[PDB]
Amino acid sequence: SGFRKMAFPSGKVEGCMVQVTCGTTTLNGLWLDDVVYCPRHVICTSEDMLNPNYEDLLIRKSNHNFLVQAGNVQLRVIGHSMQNCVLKLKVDTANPKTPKYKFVRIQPGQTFSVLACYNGSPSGVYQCAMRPNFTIKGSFLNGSCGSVGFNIDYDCVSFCYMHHMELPTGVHAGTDLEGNFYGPFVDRQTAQAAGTDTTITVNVLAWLYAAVINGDRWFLNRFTTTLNDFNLVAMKYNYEPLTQDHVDILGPLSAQTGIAVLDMCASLKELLQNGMNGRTILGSALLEDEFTPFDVVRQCSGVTF
Amino acid sequence: SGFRKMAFPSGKVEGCMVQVTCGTTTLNGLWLDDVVYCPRHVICTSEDMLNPNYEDLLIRKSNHNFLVQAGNVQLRVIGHSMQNCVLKLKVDTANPKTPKYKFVRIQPGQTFSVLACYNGSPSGVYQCAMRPNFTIKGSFLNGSCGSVGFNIDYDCVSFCYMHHMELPTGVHAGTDLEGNFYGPFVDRQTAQAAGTDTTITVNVLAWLYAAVINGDRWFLNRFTTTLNDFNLVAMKYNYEPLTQDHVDILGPLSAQTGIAVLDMCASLKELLQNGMNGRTILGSALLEDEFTPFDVVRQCS
Ligand SMILES: *[C@@]1(O)C(=O)Nc2c(Cl)ccc(Cl)c21
Ligand SMILES: *[C@@]1(O)C(=O)Nc2c(Cl)ccc(Cl)c21
Ligand SMILES: *[C@@]1(O)C(=O)Nc2c(Cl)ccc(Cl)c21
Numbered sequence: 001s002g003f004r005k006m007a008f009p010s011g012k013v014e015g016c017m018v019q020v021t022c023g024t025t026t027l028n029g030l031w032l033d034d035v036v037y038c039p040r041h042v043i044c045t046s047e048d049m050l051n052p053n054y055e056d057l058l059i060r061k062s063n064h065n066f067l068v069q070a071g072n073v074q075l076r077v078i079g080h081s082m083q084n085c086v087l088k089l090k091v092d093t094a095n096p097k098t099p100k101y102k103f104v105r106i107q108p109g110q111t112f113s114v115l116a117c118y119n120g121s122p123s124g125v126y127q128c129a130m131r132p133n134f135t136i137k138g139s140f141l142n143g144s145c146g147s148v149g150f151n152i153d154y155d156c157v158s159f160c161y162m163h164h165m166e167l168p169t170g171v172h173a174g175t176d177l178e179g180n181f182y183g184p185f186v187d188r189q190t191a192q193a194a195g196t197d198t199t200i201t202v203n204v205l206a207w208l209y210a211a212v213i214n215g216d217r218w219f220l221n222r223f224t225t226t227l228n229d230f231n232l233v234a235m236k237y238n239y240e241p242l243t244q245d246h247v248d249i250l251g252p253l254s255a256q257t258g259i260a261v262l263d264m265c266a267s268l269k270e271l272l273q274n275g276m277n278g279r280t281i282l283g284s285a286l287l288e289d290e291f292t293p294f295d296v297v298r299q300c301s302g303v304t305f
Numbered sequence: 306s307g308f309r310k311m312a313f314p315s316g317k318v319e320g321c322m323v324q325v326t327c328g329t330t331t332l333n334g335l336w337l338d339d340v341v342y343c344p345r346h347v348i349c350t351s352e353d354m355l356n357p358n359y360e361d362l363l364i365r366k367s368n369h370n371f372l373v374q375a376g377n378v379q380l381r382v383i384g385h386s387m388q389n390c391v392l393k394l395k396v397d398t399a400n401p402k403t404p405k406y407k408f409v410r411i412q413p414g415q416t417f418s419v420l421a422c423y424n425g426s427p428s429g430v431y432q433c434a435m436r437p438n439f440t441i442k443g444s445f446l447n448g449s450c451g452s453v454g455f456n457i458d459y460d461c462v463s464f465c466y467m468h469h470m471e472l473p474t475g476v477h478a479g480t481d482l483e484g485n486f487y488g489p490f491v492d493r494q495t496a497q498a499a500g501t502d503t504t505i506t507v508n509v510l511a512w513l514y515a516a517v518i519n520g521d522r523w524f525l526n527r528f529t530t531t532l533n534d535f536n537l538v539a540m541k542y543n544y545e546p547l548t549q550d551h552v553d554i555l556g557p558l559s560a561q562t563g564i565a566v567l568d569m570c571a572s573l574k575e576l577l578q579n580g581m582n583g584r585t586i587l588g589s590a591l592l593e594d595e596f597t598p599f600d601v602v603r604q605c606s
């Protein structure tokens with residue numbers, strides 16, 4: 001037993017990380033097949049914030065202006081093209097370590113692992129959730145631009161995130177691997193801010209089920225509630241609405257523990273109203289919302305990659 | 306910025322994980338060069354859980370009684386030996402993915418990453434710490450024995466933990482990679498209880514220094530303390546004694562922030578007295594004790 005914030009094994013992604021340099025800007029790239037993906041802002045300069053058209057700035061770069069290093073090996077760039085906010089650098093060598101992979105886009109509340117890198121070199125791996133305000137709570141590290149987020153299915157890596165920028169509140173923002181931003185952000189050199197965030201209710205419920213599976217039962221009570229009654233509580237406490245689909249997804253955990261979801265909602269209601277009264281849940285004095293229902297099941301049932 | 310416990314990238318260890326079977330027992334092994342390391346209790350039967358005589362069990366075994374599977378490849382076992390509580394199986398192939406590595410025995414308060422594995426296949430990676438009572442608070446299901454803990458400072462993997470068992474309180478016990486248990490535990494299923502656990506004081510202080518570097522000062526106060534008065538108070542909250550070694554180790558973070566180590570001790574004393582009153586430090590409502598002074602510089606706080 002035990003319950004830890006757990007990332008996917010990062011090996012398959014480590015073999016894909018490269019260093020990309022343009023001028024004085026070095027950041028990370030993702031090498032898959034014969035293409036290196038990185039934030040398109042790698043080419044951006046003080047001088048050219050005065051341009052509405054990235055494609056104008058990019059077409060003036062030569063292939064040789066991009067220095068791409070894969071460990072000790074220089075990778076020769078043979079083409080460059082923009083894909084929304086991601087730059088695609090065609091190179092002359094396919095990555096022999098390319099895993100089975102797909103590009104997927106995730107929803108707020110879903111979780112993934114980030115392999116934090118610095119100048120092409122993997123540094124750390126951590127698990128996180130896409131916040132309702134579409135930011136990621138990331139590391140002390142800087143220089144992590146171009147690091148990616150992913151899930152692993154079987155042997156297939158689903159890449160869902162690339163880190164583009166840090167926001168002044170200490171959270172980060174980025175895109176899917178097709179260059180579409182998560183959230184109301186741009187990658188231009190302008191000051192931006194995270195919107196007010198909310199708590200991921202269905203994930204808190206999942207984690208309360210995890211606690212119960214691990215023997216932490218003190219917060220359970222005899223009562224149940226309604227979706228409507230509870231959602232009035234959620235709104236008061238800056239929690240996301242709970243939907244019927246959330247209820248359905250928690251089905252397996254309700255069946256395994258004998259605690260129906262609206263029974264657990266009554267527990268959560270009382271925790272929000274009355275606090276934890278100096279107690280902890282799975283060693284935390286805060287209600288944890290970065291474990292999905294799927295995460296809890298996977299960790300309490302032993303799935304491997 | 307934000308604060309996250311990060312684990313080390315696990316790929317270098319993934320390439321070493323194999324499956325070891327003896328009889329009807331399957332657990333994980335670590336394949337380095339031409340040796341596979343695993344817990345010696347893989348040779349135990351249902352009758353050997355309380356008073357196993359490992360030497361007697363092992364003398365009755367042949368190389369071919371150990372099935373070692375690396376991915377879909379069966380490895381050929383060509384010898385075996387026991388070193389303390391680890392079995393070492395010599396195989397006919399050096400692991401081509403062997404990283405640069407060493408075996409290190411760690412002390413309480415040290416952190417490391419764990420690569421949880423089942424049937425030789427890695428499942429997940431997380432960060433943890435050797436508690437003062439020589440247990441670790443991991444996440445381990447049946448079949449995770451032989452999973453390892455490690456650090457990777459500078460390209461070299463330092464293996465520091467191999468998982469052997471779960472104690473009745475839901476915490477975990479294991480050995481170094483020379484097969485010596487951390488703490489007083491033995492690989493027997495007789496009653497053994499973990500010492501009462503305590504908070505790792507030097508790590509809490511390191512994390513309070515990180516909070517300051519990250520911009521948060523709300524918990525500082527105007528006081529200082531002697532080292533002995535600090536320890537007299539903090540023992541009352543089941544905090545580990547703070548030593549002069551710990552004070553010396555906090556020297557760099559002290560110099561960086563301009564907050565003297567014993568001044569930060571005074572601030573911790575008041576936090577234990579007051580609680581947090583609805584406030585968080587680096588996102589937590591409890592004082593974090595699994596981030597070492599060294600961990601703050603590996604993130605370059
Ligand atoms: C980048 O900031 C820059 O210097 N110019 C530019 C344009 Cl034209 C479009 C997008 C971006 Cl991120 C940049
Ligand atoms: C990121 O490494 C990058 O390419 N640029 C940048 C800036 Cl300007 C600030 C912070 C980070 Cl993490 C990055
Ligand atoms: C460990 O994998 C092992 O060899 N046996 C065992 C049992 Cl019986 C319970 C839990 C674990 Cl992690 C293990």
Ligand SMILES: [Mg+2]
Nearest residue numbers: 221223263266
């Ligand atoms: Mg109830």
